[PDB]
Amino acid sequence: SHKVYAHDYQAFWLWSGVNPQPALQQANQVYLHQGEVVIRQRAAWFQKMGLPSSRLTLPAMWVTVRITTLDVPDDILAILIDLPRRWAAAGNQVIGLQIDFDAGTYRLDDYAGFLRRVRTKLDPNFALGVTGLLDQQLNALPIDELVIQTYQGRSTVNQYSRYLPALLQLRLPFKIGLVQHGEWDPQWEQYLAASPFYRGEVVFLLNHLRSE
């Protein structure tokens, strides 16, 4: 049960402020962070972050946006669903849009409604993915892929293992998100391999600390 090394994995998040790493040259998928919807003055606001839409040396990619509120007008949603369009028009193979839910406490009907709205406005060639901290009802979500995050910041959350046993009940393609160099017991991988819906792991790449 060592730390997480990128050279052992093949899918990655590239977040705002993180430098590309050679592991991205062996990957099948990359999840490209592109901004966040946040509350500025009791009102939703999209802040674009990360790389500009352009041609880059990457595998098939997702556009990832962190959503900290579900009170979002249709104009922001139009922005969000244009993002994968813009990355595709630059010449990249784009799989779709991944919403990273970091939005406190809503009822699952709320998340379902948000995802239904997004799916309505998202071009049908693009898939719709979900990711978020661990937290079965999930199967009702109108999504194509779910990624269960096991980390906070630079560290794996202690007792993440409490949430993994039940994932064998998922009925949609799912992955486990790990942070680079975090604590991780890879035996869990084999466990989750029992499910025909398990699609492996995604690694959150990190930069060095200025202190190191």
Determine the 3-state secondary structure of 4 from DSSP: coil
Residue whose token pair is 């309505």: 120
**Structural tokens at position 197:** 């819906």
Name residue 177's amino acid: G
Q: Which CATH architecture has domain 6-204?
A: Alpha-Beta Barrel (3.20)
Q: Is 204 helix (H, G, I), strand (E, B) or coil?
A: strand
Backbone phi, psi, residue 195, to 5°: -85, 130
58's CB contacts (< 8 A; 6+ apart) are: 24, 30, 32, 92
Enumerate the domain spans of the chain: 6-204
How buried is 42 (Cβ within 10 angstroms: 0-12 exposed, 13-18 middle, 19+ buried)? exposed
Q: What one-letter code names the amino acid at 204?
A: F
Residue pair 68/37 in contact by the 8 Å Cβ criterion = yes
Coil, helix or strand for 183? strand
Identify how the structure was determined.
X-ray
Amino acid at 173: P
Length of the chain as a residue count: 212
